[PDB]
């Protein structure tokens, strides 16, 4: 039913708190990977990331300061980002993100762990706030209900750390940083690429159907 | 003479060959680091250098109009066909919008940093930008760490000053993901951090205006 995506843009967000705290994006990271790299993963002797990998990471000072929980987790604070001269989520962010996505062969499928409940509606809120739009044929995939569902067909924790520890028998790094989490998500995805690509070809939700937080 | 830069944007290019073949950018990577992260390089409890937490990054692959040389392709692990297979267009408007937006997110003035930048990266980037009629912010300056580190060793008185040699000399280990844009910038940033006080001082004194950078070659045409 959804359009067959050609590029999968894995993304992750660090923000100032949980959804009902009206959180602001402090960090966003995106790894763009063409479908063909996911269909036929490279392995040295273990998974290695695709050679052709467009990447974007941007830090931003939120207008609302962090929570203690969020700050210690992400290793970021409103003061820290200001000190490094980062402005908030503004037109410059939109122009860079839109440019980055236009560099990708469409249709695009955004991928995020627990995206339906957090990343997607938060990004939508920020984009809508600036009256910005994504390409019309853009869809999105939440690997959280997707992985749970795929396992039903065959109690376990489905946190990003639990999954990585389960598939690769090791600890992820650098956790709770936007770029680090996308890196972790991409490896997890690669480990289950055929099933997840299949999931996306059917269950991927239209970005237009994502409502602001 | 030069302005005091607030953001140091470390950049690396992968391209189809050496200057005399009129190479084209196939990959670009930029790490943006605020001066404060360089003035006081943060170090873990083990005392070893770690990359700044607040670190904007941009890596983009693109299919050049002309293909790679045997060497260039073998080095970078890139090829025209592989870039095409991953549906990457060439250095176009979308690259400029992304690049210019990325730089606009940085507190200026900006100092571009590249290893062998004067002889390769800066002229090549200038050629590609002129092709699309794109400009960087006027107050932008640039730093070549190759003559900088040579000059510093000459000052605080043969050795190779290649990226690999310097990383080996300063960190005594093999650099990971060598000859990839993002990998080489990562290597460059660590080298810079190893001697940040000196290089910052060098930048404040001898950083060249980007406006003085000449194109590696006059591009054929368009758009
Ligand atoms: N128990 C938690 C965990 C995370 N967060 C916030 C901080 C993070 O910026 C964001 C989740 O990002 P991530 O899952 O990548 O750590 O939500 C929160 O408010 N409470
Ligand atoms: N002996 C060399 C050194 C460099 N290059 C080209 C390939 C790279 O795309 C670009 C930058 O080199 P490097 O990856 O080593 O930084 O110059 C080349 O063709 N032959
Ligand atoms: Ca703006
Ligand atoms: Ca274990
Ligand atoms: Ca070199
Ligand atoms: Mg997240
Ligand atoms: Mg995260
Ligand atoms: Mg180089
Ligand atoms: Mg390089």
b/e code B180-192 from CB counts within 10 Å (16+ = b): bbbbbbbbbbbbb
CB-count exposure of residue A87 (10 Å: 0-12, 13-18, 19+): middle
What residues of chain B lie within 8 A of the CB of A6, using their CB? 87
Q: In the Cβ-directed half-sphere of B66, how many Cα atoms lie within 13 Å?
A: 12
**Could you tell me if A120 and A18 are in contact, meaning their C-beta atoms sit under 8 angstroms apart?**
no
3-state secondary structure of A112: strand
* Residue B61 sits at the chain A interface (C-beta within 8 Å): yes
DSSP B90-116: -S-HHHHHHHHHHHHTSPSSEEEEETT
The answer to whether A94 and A101 are in contact (CB under 8 A) is no
Q: Are B76 and B61 in contact (CB under 8 A)?
A: no
A40 Cβ under 8 Å from any chain B Cβ? no
- A53 chain-B contacts, CB cut-off 8 A: 59, 61
Q: What is the DSSP secondary structure assignment for residue A34, as one 8-state letter?
A: E
First to last CA, chain B: 36
CA angle A72, A76, A78 (to 5 degrees): 120
The residue assigned the tokens 């996306």 is A200
Cα distance between residue B52 and residue B211, in whole Å: 29
Approach to solving? X-ray
Catalytic residue, candidates B85, B135, B168, B179: B179
Burial class of residue A63 (count of CB atoms within 10 Å of its CB; 0-12, 13-18, 19+): exposed
A79 is in an annotated binding site: no
Whether the CB-CB separation of B58 and B181 falls below 8 Å is answered with no
CA of A206 to the centre of ligand 8 (A): 40
The arrangement of strands across the sheet holding A7-15 comes to A205-206, A139-142, A108-112, A7-15, A25-34, A54-59, B56-61, B25-34, B7-15, B110-114, B141-144, B208-209
Q: Which of B179, B182, B186 to mutate to test the pocket of ligand 2 (most atoms within 8 A of CB)?
A: B179
Helix (H, G, I), strand (E, B) or coil at B78: coil
Residues 6+ apart with CB under 8 A from B76: B14, B26, B27, B68, B179, B180
Q: What is the DSSP letter of B141?
A: E
Side-chain-side CA neighbours of A159 within 13 Å: the count stands at 8
The two three-digit tokens of residue A26, written as one number: 């402090």
Give me the residue label for tokens 């040295």: A44
CB contact under 8 A, B78 and A54: no
- The burial of B219, by beta-carbon neighbours within 10 Å (0-12 exposed, 13-18 middle, 19 or more buried), is given as middle
User: Which of the 8 DSSP states describes residue A172?
Assistant: -
Q: A20: which 2 tokens? A: 């009902």
Q: Which of B196, B208, B200 is nearest to B41 (CA)?
A: B196
Instruction: Write out the two tokens for A6.
Output: 């050609």
Contact of B86 with B61, CB cutoff 8 Å:
yes
CA-based nearest distance B150→chain A, Å: 29
Strands (E), B52-94: 56-61
A94 to each of A59, B102, B136, how far by Cα in Å? Answer: 13, 10, 19
Residue B113 φ/ψ, nearest 5 degrees: -125, 125
Distance A162 CA to ligand 4 centre (A): 10
For residue A119, the CA-to-ligand 6 centroid distance in Å is 6
Asked if residues A96 and A102 have their Cβ atoms less than 8 Å apart, the reply is no
Q: Which residue in B has a C-alpha nearest to residue A98's C-alpha?
A: B98
Nearest to B91 by CA among B141, B38, B154, B24: B24
Q: Which domains does chain B have, with CATH numbers?
A: 5-213 (3.30.420.10)
CB of residue B117 inside a 6 A radius of ligand 2: no
Strand residues in chain A grouped as ranges (E): 7-15, 25-34, 42-43, 47-48, 54-59, 108-112, 139-142, 205-206
Probe target for ligand 1 pocket from A16, A18, A183, with the most ligand atoms within 8 Å of CB? A18
**What element of type H or E holds B10?**
strand B7-15
- Distance CA(A53)–CA(B78), nearest Å, equals 11
Enclosing H/E stretch for B25: strand B25-34
Tell which residue, B141, B120, B139, has the closest CA to residue B210.
B141
Token pair of A136, please? 């019309």
Residue that has been written with the tokens 């990325």 in this structure: B102
Instruction: Report the candidate in B112, B164, B109, B160 with the shortest Cα–Cα distance to residue B137.
Output: B109
State the DSSP string of A144-159: HHHHHHHHHT-----S
Do residues B175 and B163 touch, judged by C-beta distance below 8 A? yes
Among candidates B87, B102, B180 on the partner chain, residue whose Cβ is nearest the Cβ of A105: B87
Nearest residue on chain A to B94, alpha-carbon basis = A99
Q: Is B127 on the interface with A (CB under 8 A)?
A: no
Q: How many CB atoms lie within 10 A of CB A17?
A: 18
Nearest ligand 2 atom to alpha carbon B75: 7
How many A from CA of B28 to the centre of ligand 9?
9
A14 annotated ligand-binding residue: yes
Q: From the centroid of its chain, how far is CA A91?
A: 20
DSSP 8-state symbol, B46: T
What are the residues whose beta carbons fall under 8 Å from the beta carbon of A65, sequence distance 6 or more? A16, A77, A78
* Residues in CB range of A5: below 8 A, 6 or more apart: A35, A106, A107, A108, A109, A139, A200, A204
Is A5 among the annotated ligand-binding positions?
Answer: no
Q: Which two tokens stand for residue B94?
A: 């979308």
Q: Is B186 a catalytic residue?
A: no
Query: Which run of H or E residues covers position B128?
Result: helix B122-131
Active site residues of A: 176
A132 alpha carbon, closest ligand: 3
The single-letter DSSP state of residue B118 is I
Partners of A142 in beta bridges: A112
Indicate the pairing of strand A139-142 with strand A108-112: parallel
Name every chain B residue with its beta carbon within 8 A of the beta carbon of A98: 97
Give the separation between CA B223 and CA B206, rounded to whole angstroms. 35
H/E segment holding residue B51: none
Name beta bridge partners: A6: none
State this model's resolution in angstroms: 2.0
Residues in contact with ligand 1 (CB, 6 Å cut-off): A 12, 14-15, 17-18, 69-70, 73-74, 176, 181
Q: Which residues contact B213 (CB under 8 A, 6 or more apart)?
A: B122, B123, B126, B142
Residues 6+ apart with CB under 8 A from A73: A176
Reading the block at residue A137, the tokens are: 């044929």
Task: Compute CA distances A63 → A15, A118, A156, whole Å.
Answer: 11, 19, 37
* A44 CB burial (10 A radius; 0-12, 13-18, 19+): exposed
């Amino acid at each position: 039913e959804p359009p067959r995506a050609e590029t999968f843009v894995f993304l992750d967000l660090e923000a100032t708190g949980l959804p009902n705290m009206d959180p602001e994006i402090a960090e966003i990271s995106l790894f763009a990977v063409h479908r063909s790299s996911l269909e036929n993963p490279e392995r040295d002797d273990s998974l290695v990331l695709p050679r052709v990998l467009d990447k974007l990471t941007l830090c931003m000072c939120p207008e609302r300061p962090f929570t203690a929980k969020a700050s210690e987790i992400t290793g970021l604070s409103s003061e820290s980002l200001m000190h490094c001269g980062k402005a908030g989520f503004n037109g410059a962010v939109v122009r860079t993100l839109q440019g980055f996505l236009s560099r990708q062969e469409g249709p695009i499928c955004l991928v995020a762990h627990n995206g339906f409940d957090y990343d997607f509606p938060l990004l939508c809120t920020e984009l809508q706030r600036l009256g910005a739009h994504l390409p019309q044929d853009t869809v999105c995939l939440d690997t959280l209900p997707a992985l749970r569902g795929l396992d039903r067909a065959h109690r376990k924790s489905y946190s990003l750390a639990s999954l990585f520890h389960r598939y690769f028998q090791a600890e992820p790094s650098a956790a709770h940083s936007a770029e680090g989490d996308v890196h972790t998500l991409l490896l997890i995805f690669l480990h289950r690429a055929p099933e997840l690509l299949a999931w996306a070809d059917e269950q991927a939700r239209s970005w237009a159907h994502i409502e602001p937080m």
